[PDB]
Symmetry: D2
Subunit: 120 residues, 4 copies
């Protein structure tokens, strides 16, 4: 039930396909949705989750380069998918920017996004 279009609290969108082999592929974009704001995503998920009501673990990465813009950074999301009527993906993320060695200490931001299949 991971496959589909998800929306987070910031208005960002990501469309993902979950493969039988554990692959996650798709696109991550802004609320705008313009070509300039769409980025490739790739990740993995647990294709054989526990049958005890636990969430499904997964992660993905977006490097913030496309054919229009380059922010010289990449975000990874790590979290879990919870299925059902109100399916959700709860994540924490790390956004690392390319930096000089001198600035490396301030290279990585941390936050949390929750995605639903519904747009507020």
């Amino acid at each position: 039930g991971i496959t589909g279009t998800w929306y987070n609290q910031l208005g960002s969108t990501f469309i993902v396909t979950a493969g039988a082999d554990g692959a996650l592929t798709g696109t991550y974009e802004s609320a705008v949705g313009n070509a300039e704001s769409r980025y490739v995503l790739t990740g993995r998920y647990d294709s054989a989750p526990a049958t005890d009501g636990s969430g499904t673990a997964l992660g993905w990465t977006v490097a913030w380069k496309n054919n229009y813009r380059n922010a010289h950074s990449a975000t990874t999301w790590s979290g879990q998918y919870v299925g059902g009527a109100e399916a959700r993906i709860n994540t924490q993320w790390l956004l690392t920017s390319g930096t000089t060695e001198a600035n490396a200490w301030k290279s990585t931001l941390v936050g949390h996004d929750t995605f639903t299949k519904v747009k507020p």
Copy 2:
């Protein structure tokens, strides 16, 4: 110079292919086939040319043909080239949990990789 074999302080190994397009693809070895896992990620395939590192990230879901930990790790970091190339990362390891345990679902840490085995 990202493509190749990388070793962490713990002795984890991963071998990765960096596609011209920004793709990272390879395997992560937790130390044997039993301990080999698929990894995929992304990197900046056009980094700044000012001495800045190259941003990247990847994910491993800890399931293979032998074991399933019902968890996934993502590493976020940057590649620094040179005579002593390195990948400096921080990571998030999320386990699949019940809702009641979701507060303790995620570990955080850091890994530095080099192309030299210790």
Copy 3:
């Protein structure tokens, strides 16, 4: 506006006093609030925040030892206070357990708590 009794989304309670010198002192407890579940906190906050509508930075620590229990761990919350008739403290936290060197890699949990002055 930081001084007072706050509740997060787990039901945990923390009572804090914010001193003029930037000190945070008080107690962190469970929803029940019995003696066995109360722990000392101490932290710091920006006693002269920006006057541009920005939050107030702060942080605090609880070591999970009191005179009843000892978890051999400590949590730090890093976040900001946002004033309002609906004031809130948005935080991320790190919970580190004492470990052997072998297990140090899995010593630290990360998460996020939001506190309000109303029970959930």
Copy 4:
């Protein structure tokens, strides 16, 4: 063994008193001029496990003193390991006061190891 002067890899220094009760109190210096010194306060486990495990601890610095105000605070969470080469291994979170619109980028994360050796 926590009480003393500690040095990070970046050359930050901090001087801390560990109270019998679990209190950490002291100062954190960036550069060691007055302009660069800040108050720290935290907590540590004053009755650690006696099984080779580290001692859990954490502390906070709000980056305001009589000279500068960065409108931010860092918390370090980690553990003390004693010995001939005592160390404090930490991860940290640095949160800046921000507008709501920028709150998503309010927090940096990283890691610091401290030793009592300059």
